[PDB]
Every structure is written in C-alpha cells, then in structure tokens.
Write a structure and sequence with these properties.
Helix content is 46%, strand content 19%. It is of the alpha+beta class.
Length: 325
C-alpha cells in the first residue's frame, strides 16, 4: 500500500515534531511553574499584610503595639521586593540582566525592566507567554477602592470623622472628578455635609450654600455622581476630605503607606480617627493587590492549560498512531 507507506512516513514525521519540541515544552513548563511558586509566595505575604491592616483598624489596640506591627510590615515589604527581584531576572521582561525593582533616592520604588513578554513555541502552531513583566505584576495596581481614593486634606481635621472606602454604585451616573467634601455649620447651628468638584462645581447641594445642604447623619450613606460612601464619628465644622480618581500604585507603595500609617499617633480619639480613613483605603489596596495577583495566577494557569492540552493531543496521537501501526 503506497498509502500504508505514506501513513508510516506521516507518523514518522509527526512523531519527530513531538520529540523536537520537548526541550521547549519542558522549558515552558519549568518557567511557568517557577513563576507560580513565586506568585503564590507573594499572595502569602499579602494575606499576612491584610491581617495586619485588619488588626491596625481596631480602636482598642495600643499605640506602641500598633507601631511594632510596622516592623513586621517592613519584613513583608522586603519579602515582596525579594519575590519581585527573584532571579536572569524573572519579572523584568526582555532586559534579562536588569534588576526590575529598586528604590530611588526620592524614596519611591521604580521599575527598571520593560513590558515585553517572551513566547515559547511548544508546537508548530502554538505560542505561549513564558513570563510576566514587573510593571504588570507588582507596579500597576489601582489605588483606593479601585475606582476612587479618599484622603485627608492639607488642613488637618479636628473632629473624629472618618470615611469608608466606598464604591461606584451606579455606572451610568458615574462622574470622575477631584471632589472635596467639607462639613459646615448650618444657619440653625447644625452640622451639614457639602461636596464640590473642580470640573463639576457644586454637587451637594447644587446651590453651594450651607442652608440648602443635607444634615450629617452618623454612619449614613452620602452619595453623588454614581458613588457612595459612609462617614462615621463626629466631624467638626471645617473638617474635610479629598475624593479623587484612582492612580496606578505598586504593591510596594501600599505597604509603605501602611508602615507610615502604623507609625502615626494612636491614643486620643481624634488621633485614631485620623488613621481610620487611611486604614480603610489600605485594606482595599491590599485586596486589590490580592485580586490582582490572583488574575496573573489565573492567566499563568491558563498558559499551563494550553501546554497540558497540547501534551494530551500528543499522548492521544501516539495512542492512535500505535493503533494504526
């Protein structure tokens, strides 16, 4: 059977393609599996940091005991740096010999790599990303709740007010701006809430005028332009907060903020409320980090699943080739 011969040869040639891509398959497999192990170490570090942030938000924790948690925080920051600078550097893209994350003289951590992914050919027609890049994994994560950030203004607050991380509850109505939220005394002497924005002008109330503004209610939801957030405690006329859109920000920066927030004073009721708005932000930012690394793990696991699915196709072709021959 010149057909039988033809088959024999096609099996010869497909079998050789399988052998010729082994080094690569093994190569792609080790690299990915090794990355997973590092990413999972980062998740372990992040979880430990989350537990610190939850602990740090408890009002009945000493100032001294709170400060000492800052030391562990640093240990975990270092862990993350280590993982990010794992070695040829894993998370630096095409700049193999360049240390991806380093600390500049301003005090901010910066990324020295580039954003190029390497793709390994594991079959004639299949290409699989073999690495991730430091900018994507550790550096570009959204601040605040993921959509907007809340920080205390330059004029420091004198009350015990603090804000939750909030959320965008109505996307249709969402409007990005740099909002300022201020509390003021009414004409009748009561505490009222006001909100305005650079681009949007006066939001709550449109009037701008205190007498038109809604009374402050502790633990109540204040909402405007698609957003919604809860102020707690007793603010003082004059106190204010900035609500801004979310910056990209590295896991590292988040932990630095943690270290700084842990070192703030924490015995007086006013002092504690100062830390709280920020406590709520950092919890979000850790969860954003946690979620974010998970998505990189998920995509890494997808890339594995491309490669295992190819190996199955192989093992099935041998089983069928056997059957013929």
């Amino acid at each position: 059977d010149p057909v039988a011969s033809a088959q024999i040869e096609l099996i010869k040639q497909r079998i050789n393609n399988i052998e010729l891509f082994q080094n690569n398959r093994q190569a792609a497999d080790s690299a990915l599996r090794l990355e997973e192990g590092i990413l999972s170490n980062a998740v372990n570090s992040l979880h430990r940091l989350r537990e610190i942030q939850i602990q740090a938000g408890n009002p009945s924790l000493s100032e001294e005991d709170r400060k000492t948690l800052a030391v562990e925080a640093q240990a975990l920051l270092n862990q993350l740096l280590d993982y990010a600078n794992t070695k040829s550097y894993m998370f630096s893209g095409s700049k193999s010999l360049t240390q991806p994350v380093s600390l500049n003289l301003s005090g901010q951590y910066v990324y020295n790599g580039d954003s190029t992914q390497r793709f390994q050919a594991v079959t004639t027609s299949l290409l699989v990303a073999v690495n991730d890049t430091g900018d994507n994994v550790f550096m570009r994560i959204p601040s605040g709740n993921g959509r907007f950030a809340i920080r205390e203004t330059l004029t420091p607050n004198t009350g015990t007010a603090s804000v939750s991380s909030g959320s965008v509850t109505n996307e249709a109505a969402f409007v990005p701006d740099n909002y300022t939220m201020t509390f003021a005394l009414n004409s009748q002497g009561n505490l009222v809430v006001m909100v305005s924005g650079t681009l949007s002008g006066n939001v709550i109330p449109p009037s701008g005028l205190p007498d038109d503004a809604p009374l402050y209610q502790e633990g109540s939801a204040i909402g405007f332009n698609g957003m919604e957030m809860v102020v707690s405690g007793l603010p003082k006329a004059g106190d204010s907060f900035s609500i801004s859109p979310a910056k990209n920000e590295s896991i590292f920066s988040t932990v630095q903020r943690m270290i700084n927030n842990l070192n703030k004073p924490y015995t007086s009721s006013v002092e504690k409320a100062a830390t709280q708005t920020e406590n709520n932000q950092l919890l979000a930012q850790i969860d954003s980090a946690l979620g974010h690394i998970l998505s990189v793990q998920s995509d890494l696991g997808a890339r594995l699943n491309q490669l295992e699915t190819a190996e199955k196709a192989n093992n099935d072709y041998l089983d069928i080739s056997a059957a013929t021959l």
